[PDB]
Amino acid sequence: GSSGSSGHSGEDLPMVAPGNVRVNVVNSTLAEVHWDPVPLKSIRGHLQGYRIYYWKTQSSSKRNRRHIEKKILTFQGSKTHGMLPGLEPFSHYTLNVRVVNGKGEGPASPDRVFNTPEGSGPSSG
């Protein structure tokens, strides 16, 4: 076989994703992800931001419009941590970090997990 043709010229694009990924749950509804500040050599050009993809785990939609809600988070500029607000308590979540530059994204780093504690607020039933 082959599978080939198409070429390009230009297109600087990123190459690797951030080191030492971790996440710390902060509040019942708020977590804080951590990652390493990648080299410009991997960014190739001008770092726009970190994006984070994440989804609800341990809910599992089932039957009625069965899919997984795969949400996105936006941290422009060269942070090394970024919060997950507007989540749920007593739930598992999965997320991953991706670099973005002036040309596009590159790869996403290894996925991570966090479970949120229990709750807080005027719950009753």
Side-chain angles (χ1 to χ4, degrees):
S2 172
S3 47
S5 311
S6 168
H8 64 158
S9 302
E11 320 204 291
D12 213 4
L13 287 165
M15 297 197 336
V16 300
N20 185 230
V21 189
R22 49 219 190 81
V23 28
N24 28 291
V25 181
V26 168
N27 306 329
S28 357
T29 43
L30 187 61
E32 165 161 73
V33 184
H34 261 254
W35 66 77
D36 277 332
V38 284
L40 285 99
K41 282 284 196 185
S42 70
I43 295 165
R44 287 204 57 114
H46 295 240
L47 184 69
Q48 283 284 323
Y50 297 94
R51 187 175 287 177
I52 292 182
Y53 281 66
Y54 65 105
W55 54 93
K56 184 78 161 284
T57 305
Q58 305 299 88
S59 210
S60 204
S61 181
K62 198 164 185 64
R63 243 254 195 277
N64 190 246
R65 205 162 205 71
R66 177 164 179 275
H67 63 315
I68 295 176
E69 290 141 298
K70 298 192 191 160
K71 214 146 183 150
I72 298 107
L73 213 60
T74 302
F75 296 113
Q76 290 156 26
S78 323
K79 25 276 275 66
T80 49
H81 63 105
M83 303 206 98
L84 256 303
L87 282 289
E88 276 289 299
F90 211 135
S91 300
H92 211 208
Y93 279 94
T94 308
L95 62 324
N96 46 96
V97 195
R98 193 177 200 134
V99 314
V100 180
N101 83 352
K103 195 57 249 170
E105 44 53 57
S109 256
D111 52 277
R112 290 279 176 277
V113 306
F114 62 95
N115 74 111
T116 47
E118 178 147 70
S120 49
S123 27
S124 294

